[PDB]
Design an enzyme around this catalytic site. Structure first.
Site, PDB file in Angstrom:
ATOM      1  N   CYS A  33      30.446-104.072  -9.790  1.00 52.78           N
ATOM      2  CA  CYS A  33      30.154-102.730 -10.282  1.00 52.78           C
ATOM      3  C   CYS A  33      29.346-101.910  -9.275  1.00 52.78           C
ATOM      4  CB  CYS A  33      29.409-102.806 -11.613  1.00 52.78           C
ATOM      5  SG  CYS A  33      30.239-103.809 -12.855  1.00 52.78           S
TER       6      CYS A  33
ATOM      7  N   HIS B  80      34.024 -97.331 -17.540  1.00 55.58           N
ATOM      8  CA  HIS B  80      33.457 -98.120 -16.463  1.00 55.58           C
ATOM      9  C   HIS B  80      34.558 -98.714 -15.581  1.00 55.58           C
ATOM     10  CE1 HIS B  80      30.183 -99.984 -14.393  1.00 55.58           C
ATOM     11  NE2 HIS B  80      30.543-101.214 -14.702  1.00 55.58           N
TER      12      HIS B  80
ATOM     13  N   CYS C  74      24.033-102.024 -12.153  1.00 51.80           N
ATOM     14  CA  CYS C  74      23.859-103.482 -12.191  1.00 51.80           C
ATOM     15  C   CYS C  74      25.136-104.196 -11.750  1.00 51.80           C
ATOM     16  CB  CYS C  74      23.422-103.963 -13.579  1.00 51.80           C
ATOM     17  SG  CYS C  74      24.693-103.864 -14.860  1.00 51.80           S
TER      18      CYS C  74
ATOM     19  N   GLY D 281      27.328-108.077 -11.571  1.00 51.37           N
ATOM     20  CA  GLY D 281      27.511-109.458 -12.000  1.00 51.37           C
ATOM     21  C   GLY D 281      27.082-110.432 -10.921  1.00 51.37           C
TER      22      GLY D 281
HETATM   23  C1  LIG Z   1      33.425-105.257 -24.987  1.00 53.18           C
HETATM   24  C2  LIG Z   1      34.931-105.302 -24.780  1.00 53.18           C
HETATM   25  C3  LIG Z   1      35.352-106.747 -24.533  1.00 53.18           C
HETATM   26  C4  LIG Z   1      35.647-104.735 -26.024  1.00 53.18           C
HETATM   27  O1  LIG Z   1      36.768-105.453 -26.517  1.00 53.18           O
HETATM   28  P1  LIG Z   1      37.907-104.655 -27.449  1.00 53.18           P
HETATM   29  O2  LIG Z   1      37.607-104.975 -29.045  1.00 53.18           O
HETATM   30  O3  LIG Z   1      39.280-105.151 -27.064  1.00 53.18           O
HETATM   31  O4  LIG Z   1      37.835-103.004 -27.170  1.00 53.18           O
HETATM   32  P2  LIG Z   1      38.259-101.940 -28.400  1.00 53.18           P
HETATM   33  O5  LIG Z   1      37.883-100.533 -27.984  1.00 53.18           O
HETATM   34  O6  LIG Z   1      39.878-102.038 -28.718  1.00 53.18           O
HETATM   35  O7  LIG Z   1      37.401-102.356 -29.778  1.00 53.18           O
HETATM   36  C5  LIG Z   1      38.069-102.602 -31.008  1.00 53.18           C
HETATM   37  C6  LIG Z   1      37.740-101.603 -32.149  1.00 53.18           C
HETATM   38  O8  LIG Z   1      36.333-101.068 -32.202  1.00 53.18           O
HETATM   39  C7  LIG Z   1      36.383 -99.606 -32.058  1.00 53.18           C
HETATM   40  N1  LIG Z   1      35.211 -98.873 -31.528  1.00 53.18           N
HETATM   41  C8  LIG Z   1      34.766 -98.952 -30.254  1.00 53.18           C
HETATM   42  N2  LIG Z   1      33.635 -98.079 -30.125  1.00 53.18           N
HETATM   43  C9  LIG Z   1      33.424 -97.467 -31.362  1.00 53.18           C
HETATM   44  C10 LIG Z   1      32.458 -96.525 -31.794  1.00 53.18           C
HETATM   45  N3  LIG Z   1      31.453 -96.042 -30.859  1.00 53.18           N
HETATM   46  N4  LIG Z   1      32.470 -96.087 -33.069  1.00 53.18           N
HETATM   47  C11 LIG Z   1      33.429 -96.557 -33.958  1.00 53.18           C
HETATM   48  N5  LIG Z   1      34.389 -97.493 -33.527  1.00 53.18           N
HETATM   49  C12 LIG Z   1      34.373 -97.933 -32.245  1.00 53.18           C
HETATM   50  C13 LIG Z   1      37.818 -99.246 -31.765  1.00 53.18           C
HETATM   51  O9  LIG Z   1      38.263 -97.917 -31.741  1.00 53.18           O
HETATM   52  C14 LIG Z   1      38.643-100.359 -32.311  1.00 53.18           C
HETATM   53  O10 LIG Z   1      39.383-100.150 -33.493  1.00 53.18           O
HETATM   54  P3  LIG Z   1      40.449-101.331 -33.940  1.00 53.18           P
HETATM   55  O11 LIG Z   1      39.995-102.742 -33.207  1.00 53.18           O
HETATM   56  O12 LIG Z   1      40.409-101.539 -35.578  1.00 53.18           O
HETATM   57  O13 LIG Z   1      41.832-100.937 -33.480  1.00 53.18           O
HETATM   58  C15 LIG Z   1      35.328-104.441 -23.560  1.00 53.18           C
HETATM   59  O14 LIG Z   1      35.298-103.066 -23.789  1.00 53.18           O
HETATM   60  C16 LIG Z   1      34.484-104.819 -22.335  1.00 53.18           C
HETATM   61  O15 LIG Z   1      34.831-105.691 -21.620  1.00 53.18           O
HETATM   62  N6  LIG Z   1      33.140-104.228 -22.204  1.00 53.18           N
HETATM   63  C17 LIG Z   1      32.324-104.630 -21.056  1.00 53.18           C
HETATM   64  C18 LIG Z   1      32.954-104.394 -19.672  1.00 53.18           C
HETATM   65  C19 LIG Z   1      32.138-104.898 -18.477  1.00 53.18           C
HETATM   66  O16 LIG Z   1      31.482-105.881 -18.602  1.00 53.18           O
HETATM   67  N7  LIG Z   1      32.156-104.150 -17.216  1.00 53.18           N
HETATM   68  C20 LIG Z   1      31.317-104.587 -16.106  1.00 53.18           C
HETATM   69  C21 LIG Z   1      29.823-104.728 -16.398  1.00 53.18           C
HETATM   70  S1  LIG Z   1      28.832-105.640 -15.171  1.00 53.18           S
END
Ligand SMILES: CC(C)(COP(=O)(O)OP(=O)(O)OC[C@H]1O[C@@H](n2cnc3c(N)ncnc32)[C@H](O)[C@@H]1OP(=O)(O)O)[C@@H](O)C(=O)NCCC(=O)NCCS
Ligand SMILES: CC(C)(COP(=O)(O)OP(=O)(O)OC[C@H]1O[C@@H](n2cnc3c(N)ncnc32)[C@@H](O)[C@@H]1OP(=O)(O)O)[C@@H](O)C(=O)NCCC(=O)NCCS
Ligand SMILES: CC(C)(COP(=O)(O)OP(=O)(O)OC[C@H]1O[C@@H](n2cnc3c(N)ncnc32)[C@H](O)[C@@H]1OP(=O)(O)O)[C@@H](O)C(=O)NCCC(=O)NCCS
Ligand SMILES: CC(C)(COP(=O)(O)OP(=O)(O)OC[C@H]1O[C@@H](n2cnc3c(N)ncnc32)[C@H](O)[C@@H]1OP(=O)(O)O)[C@@H](O)C(=O)NCCC(=O)NCCS
Ligand code: NA
Ligand code: NA
Lengths: 389, 389, 389, 389
Positions: free
Chosen positions: B86, B345, B375, B377
């Site tokens: 990142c 991101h 930050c 990893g």
């Molecule tokens: C955390 C992570 C694994 C999420 O997984 P995911 O569940 O597949 O992502 P999604 O957006 O499809 O989330 C699923 C649900 O929650 C919801 N949601 C997400 N944010 C929301 C919010 N602020 N308010 C309401 N709902 C929300 C979706 O719209 C969705 O609906 P559904 O599952 O019923 O269809 C992924 O986004 C990620 O990897 N985050 C970190 C990335 C990272 O580490 N980058 C480098 C850092 S060093």
């Protein structure tokens, strides 16, 4: 200004060879700990580790970081990977010199690591394939050996230079053999004992110590050489024989100021006096070491004839010849211990590999001014000038 | 003595969304073209393109050289990619700054590009699988989101900073909510129109222009934020709502000497006064930006309170809350237009992405002293101090 | 001597549609239960289950056994699958009939099931791939739709028939539209309700009841059809609109002797009066029904004009037209309710799907003599004569 | 009624051994040719080819047909595959006999072919994988060796049988070692020469003739047997040594009526007096042959003691011992020339492999009444009674 305290390379392994199952970073740590030990420097004094690596696919988060941590460099330090293809290994050394020159660091380990052997096959499958065959792409062929502009092998760029400098089958074959021989001899005279730090391929049926370049063929003959068919052009000139191979290896160098070395009472393996990188047409990328070798010497105030010893990477006979002809330095000081046709070409590490062979061999014969340089896919060269202290 | 003459980023796309089938180098090309255009500098003056990228798997030789050449930059320039996770996007700028600072280059275009959508699944298959099931690895989760040392998800490291800093669920929820709201308001109020260069998604079924960040959710409420289940621990605190997402995007800067810009009548977005990178325990990599942000302020001779504007990346709510809490800078100057929790991101390009928002918000509100930080990893931090002219 | 006591078929599903994630044996299970309920016969009384299935890769051991067991047929009974491509569904019935004919069994459930949706991509990886790209093969295309001799798609065998028989694009489209309109009438009039058993697609968020053929289009025009591009030959004649589709579905019949049926007070759907399979040149495989139908009629001692109702499978408009032309039967008693072009074509099941439609239409209209027939990739045909009791 | 006019099988090949790259149908073709040549019957007289085959994934449309065309069986004839797992090869013969019995064919070639070596890995990728690792399933394990109901390996059902019958490790080893020694004796005495037809593995690097069972080990010792580890239950009794192998090969018989045989002056290997297939609990699937043999004997009007020769397939030492103990037949007439543990076990052809061994040994020692029998995954057994003329 900036010197190379110490250096080391793993032996260079054949494709699916001694390192068939040894992830790059494992080769890298060994080499990090190697430069460290040889310099009398503690891992806690390393600010950063910079490692050329073209094929980290599947190896997990930042293989440079992994390599430094396994080698005992503390979490406090930093590590990153970089990629200028076959230039990566040498360029990492320059990028590290520049960390010290700008005052952003004091001690760097830099070089390259590559496990071509461990490179995965992949395919993009998120959208889903609804119907029909799809290709599993060899990331080694695609991401390192194929030109992203014309879609053909580096092997084809070689053929290009061949027809552009009218190099014959035999002329190239002659280059290969000489390389093969120079490499075999050097090995026998134990000329690689110093630079090579041994790697322990730990098994479960037993540990194996690798401390010798397994790619070099002994008893190289121009006549079995001449029996090979071209590898790319059906009626071409380039063969599996007059071209380098696919290989696993690692190599690096401990960098610090000339001032820092004195305080630690270290006898530096040399001083980085200049470096350059320049581009050319992708179709003839093997010419890169020419504009690069000139801009590097220019920056040094060195004349082509000041050079006591040269390391021009033998990506291909066809192109190495071109380089040698165009710049016309004394071939007797070019690749004195054999080039990569014999020793092997671990893409991301190759530049630091030849850097070691330069430095140890410079030391060996007390030569004052050396140069190392490699060609780069996409159409580039990279070169560096070293001067003994 | 090194200034950011100009800058450009793509809109940031949602996972498998508007850029679902757009390779990184393409977004990178559009972005390289723009910085040249916005600085009024010709492609033929670019010495080198330096692009951060974490997930090049499958994209062909040196994508950086691919973006560069597609953007018109001549075969004579050079290009390469680097990976410090990142931190890549920002680090590349720092490396580019060094190129000119050491006198090795005059003009660099630097930043990053990431296509997490295009990232493929892979498997090492050269030995062949004699018998049994094997795993096709998702390189996005494996090379980008998985800690090499502890084997769990970055999200799990956030949980670590969550427990270490005792940040409750509602605490992070509220953080995300603000982010989302500041992103929505900034988008509607047009505060993103400057930094964004429109990207043309060429489709067989027609062309599409993407010029808006599609990840931002309008009408983000605290309630819907608190209706989600933990994404990394059955009984945990981190959720999809308080973590960044997986995204596509590209972003770049064009650096040259402060003298060069004056020769051209160019009014730079800023001067790079300092930068730094530090390491920490991989288990809590989220804390990374603390040692780095500080080291950078020190190298700059700046007090914390000297800052007019801060961009501190929001990999996760947990970690960002922690960084803000430690440094204690006035929150109302941190992520003024929202952070990566809303915007996205795009890993490799994320660092250059926040630098973009930083610069154009520094210009419009007339701030003098700015800093971005991210930050990384494997436990690392990156930071850069900027100042208007 | 052998009668079809009862029959049942699932609705035919669209490619990646209603049954996109439903394994064939689950479709199979439901259908077996149905022919049991409909006949007043208990699962406990079944002796063997024979199910034609072309694409069972990855579904586990003997999917046919998985279905019988899921339907509560006892472990003491036996089950197996067989594969005569598109002819499989009907052939299994001829095969069930033989079991009883030779005194080796009393009660058979026979038919076919297919999930073309669930068919996987595969590759031989044991030997390993040293170098280069390999193909992940689509098993559906490779194992079900490509001629193993000529290398081309079945659609290309259809072009072959179109040229030999000089059937024009317009003659073909007309056949196709007529098929769609008949099927739509039949569906709307409810003529498919008898043969269809509902299938409940279990799903985390909501169970869905599938009890109508979803691949039958409504109000489809000659115009839209005429505008389609050839699918198998950039200047051909066969299109997605005048070829069968790719589909999921299962279908079965419960076989027993006429006497056994009489003891049970079952009123059979019909008497199996004869069957036949014959080979033809693979290049014109769509002509298979011609020879097969003739042999079957001859075995039954019937003239073509004795037939009251015919189900002549529509793999391709081209071949469907050729068959009718050669055979000469009153086309108004052929595919009275429309055929595969409009209804779908789950290969392993198709043979039994049309048997279902034949049997139930014969019942509702008081038809005495019927015939069912399908063409078979690689150069075969199969047909079966049914007589009402 | 129905006789076996002639028979033939290929040498049985080791996993990824002699036939590591040979598709099943190529082995199948050779064996069709062999039965024809042996009976004096011309290819042109074949009506249908029925080949058991469990792992056809990736081989293309209906490998049965491919085998038949390759052997020059005319395009007017027919061909299909069938799958009752390990019982397939023997079941195909019963099926083939039925075609003749019901008057629907005159000349049948039936058996099985299997290339476990060429079975591919697969995965269902139509829906796409949005994120995360996924499995490449080994079709051989999944579709040939794993129970569909309990999910464990066939070898675990063998363990289950071991417990139930209290068969010690040592007693299983003794059985396995006896098998190896009986096979070695037959192989050196030349007792496999009559049944085996040579197969030429056509290699670009010079052809190879495979005409000997390569899996049979010479001079195997009870001591190395006894050191082996349990392969399925880490504290169980079944090992690689006392379990059958993974193998390639093919076998068939030419079928026709007794009357027909007489009209052609042919002396048949034997008369098919009866056959049977029966179900058992999937958990102890290895017990199948018990009820199946008994049903066949009863159908034949024979007492167990009437048998002169028996081929009871050796899926695992444990099940073979259970079967022999339940049936009570003199073990010295069972698997007289060794069994599957020593010879190999190519799923789809196995049933026809032991038919071959049975038939030629019966001819050799003038045995009058014989029986072949195999267990089937999913809880079934098949068996057939043969009588000399
Ligand atoms: C955390 C992570 C694994 C999420 O997984 P995911 O569940 O597949 O992502 P999604 O957006 O499809 O989330 C699923 C649900 O929650 C919801 N949601 C997400 N944010 C929301 C919010 N602020 N308010 C309401 N709902 C929300 C979706 O719209 C969705 O609906 P559904 O599952 O019923 O269809 C992924 O986004 C990620 O990897 N985050 C970190 C990335 C990272 O580490 N980058 C480098 C850092 S060093
Ligand atoms: C050139 C290339 C395509 C060759 O493919 P390859 O077939 O895998 O190479 P191989 O040597 O294993 O091919 C087979 C044969 O060549 C031979 N051979 C190679 N060098 C020989 C020599 N000097 N003398 C005699 N025989 C030789 C044999 O060892 C052999 O016979 P075998 O069937 O018993 O093994 C490949 O090695 C390559 O891509 N090299 C260049 C990569 C690159 O460009 N790196 C970066 C630069 S930009
Ligand atoms: C013919 C075949 C190749 C079609 O491929 P496909 O294009 O992916 O399938 P589709 O139905 O989505 O056809 C594509 C388009 O034509 C349209 N179309 C198809 N049938 C139509 C009709 N009857 N009327 C109007 N439009 C029609 C689509 O709705 C669609 O529009 P879009 O691409 O703009 O969204 C495939 O279905 C096939 O292989 N069928 C037969 C194979 C076979 O031999 N089966 C076994 C018997 S031997
Ligand atoms: C049992 C099975 C898993 C074998 O595992 P494997 O290790 O992959 O195959 P191997 O034969 O190489 O066994 C491994 C080892 O034991 C040895 N071994 C095997 N049989 C031996 C014997 N009879 N005597 C002495 N040593 C023997 C090896 O030669 C080898 O040594 P190594 O570890 O140094 O290489 C496999 O054969 C199988 O699954 N069998 C069941 C087939 C089946 O179920 N058919 C259907 C039933 S209805
Ligand atoms: Na066929
Ligand atoms: Na019994």
């Amino acid at each position: 200004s900036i010197v190379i305290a110490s250096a080391a390379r793993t032996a260079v392994g054949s494709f699916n060879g001694a390192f068939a199952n040894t992830p790059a970073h494992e080769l890298g740590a060994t080499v990090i700990s190697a430069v460290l030990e040889r310099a009398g420097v503690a891992a806690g004094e390393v600010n950063e580790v910079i490692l050329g690596q073209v094929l980290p696919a599947g190896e997990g988060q930042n293989p440079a970081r992994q390599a430094a941590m396994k080698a005992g460099v503390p979490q406090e330090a930093t590590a990153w990977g970089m990629n200028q293809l076959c230039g990566s290994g040498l360029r990492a050394v320059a990028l590290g010199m520049q960390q010290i020159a700008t005052g952003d660091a004091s001690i760097i380990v830099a070089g390259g690591m590559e496990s071509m052997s461990m490179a995965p096959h992949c395919a993009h499958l998120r959208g889903g394939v609804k119907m029909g065959d799809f290709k599993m792409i060899d990331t080694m062929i695609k991401d390192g050996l194929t030109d992203a502009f014309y879609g053909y092998h580096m092997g084809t760029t070689a053929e290009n230079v061949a027809k552009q400098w009218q190099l014959s089958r035999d002329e190239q074959d002659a280059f290969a053999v000489a390389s093969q021989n120079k490499a075999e001899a050097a090995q026998k005279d134990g000329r690689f004992k110093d630079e090579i730090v041994p790697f322990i391929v730990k098994g479960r049926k037993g540990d194996i110590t690798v401390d010798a370049d397994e790619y070099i063929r002994h008893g190289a003959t121009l006549d079995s050489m001449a029996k090979l068919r071209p590898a790319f052009d059906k009626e071409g000139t380039v063969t599996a024989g007059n071209a380098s191979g696919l290989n696993d290896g690692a190599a690096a160098a401990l960098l610090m100021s000339e001032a820092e070395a004195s305080r630690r009472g270290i006898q530096p393996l040399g001083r980085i006096v200049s470096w350059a990188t320049v581009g050319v047409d992708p179709k003839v990328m093997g010419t890169g070491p020419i504009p690069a070798s000139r801009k590097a010497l220019e920056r040094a105030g060195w004349k082509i004839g000041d050079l006591d010893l040269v390391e021009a990477d033998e990506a291909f006979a066809a192109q190495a010849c071109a380089v040698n002809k165009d710049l016309g330095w004394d071939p007797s000081i070019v690749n004195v211990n054999g080039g990569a046709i014999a020793i092997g070409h671990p893409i991301g590490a190759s530049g630091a590999r030849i850097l070691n062979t330069l430095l140890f061999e410079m030391k060996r014969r007390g030569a004052r001014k050396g140069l190392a340089t490699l060609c780069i896919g996409g159409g580039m060269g990279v070169a560096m000038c070293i001067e003994s202290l």
